[PDB]
């Protein structure tokens, strides 16, 4: 249905350890396509997906150039925040930015994002209207007034509505052969005893894309989500994902429990059982 373009910035101040570190990673949907690390000795935005090697040098020095001047702007912002929050140089601080766009079957903009964080907490976010700001504390409220006076939201709304969605389309065509490809999960179920009268049944989902999946357990046609351990959806390491859901059942009753795997990669939601 939807497709997303997002960039993730991380600024970390390293006190006495030199100038601060700047990282930029870009994602299309659930696939990472670009990367930048100020520490890395390349001094360049680098492709993190094979379909990106299609782009020429003109694309990358541009992409390096912006990410370099952004590293500078974020170097100043680190000091500014330190001033707002009355912090000392001794401590290491982190500011985050995530921005990007969702698009619908139209190709037109579905939604747009531009948010910031300081030391792991909301700082400032652009609202869904793309014309107003949500500032977490009163230090963020300062930035908000400046930003309103500077007309930042118009500039952002313009990048999001225009530039963001064009390149999203463009990246989608470049990586069409995998980004629009759907990977169904590999589903097995496993048994591991706990006690002389209890066992753990585990529903596996292997090598699927995208990351959105649903692993439900039920007994006799009625789900028991109260008695279910379930991991975070993790990376398989090759681009795809894996997740599992477990349930403590009596060692006497195994067939009475059925797992239900739901994924966009599958034509029909499939069910598994211990054999």
């Amino acid at each position: 249905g939807s497709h997303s373009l997002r960039y993730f910035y991380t600024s970390v101040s390293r006190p006495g350890r030199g100038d601060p570190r700047f990282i930029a990673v870009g994602y299309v949907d659930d696939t990472q396509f670009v990367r930048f690390d100020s520490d890395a000795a390349t001094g360049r935005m680098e492709p993190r997906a094979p379909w990106m090697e299609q782009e020429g040098p003109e694309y990358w020095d541009r992409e390096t150039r912006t990410v370099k001047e952004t590293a500078q702007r974020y170097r100043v912002d680190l000091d500014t925040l330190r001033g707002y929050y009355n912090q000392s140089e001794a401590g290491s601080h982190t500011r985050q930015t995530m921005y990007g766009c969702d698009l619908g079957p139209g190709g037109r903009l579905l939604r747009g994002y531009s948010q910031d964080a300081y030391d792991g907490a909301d700082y400032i976010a652009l609202n869904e209207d793309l014309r107003s700001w949500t500032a977490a504390d009163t230090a963020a409220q300062i930035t908000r007034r400046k930003w309103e006076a500077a007309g930042t939201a118009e500039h952002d709304r313009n990048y999001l509505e225009t530039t963001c969605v064009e390149w999203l389309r463009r990246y989608l065509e470049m990586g069409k052969e995998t980004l629009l490809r759907a990977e169904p999960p590999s589903t097995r179920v496993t048994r591991h005893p706990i006690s002389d009268h209890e066992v753990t049944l585990r529903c596996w989902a292997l090598g699927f894309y995208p990351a959105e999946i649903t692993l439900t357990w039920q007994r006799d046609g009625e789900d028991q989500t109260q008695d279910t351990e379930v991991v975070d959806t993790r990376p398989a390491g090759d681009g795809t994902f894996q997740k599992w859901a477990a349930v403590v059942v009596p060692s006497g009753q195994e067939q009475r429990y059925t797992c239900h795997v739901q994924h966009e990669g599958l034509a029909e939601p499939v069910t598994r059982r211990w054999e």
């Binding site: 960039y7 930015t97 300062i142 400046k146 930042t152």
Partner: peptide, 9 residues
């Protein structure tokens, strides 16, 4: 394409 400009805090 990454946004060319960011507004300082």
């Amino acid at each position: 394409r990454t946004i060319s400009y960011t507004y300082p805090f």
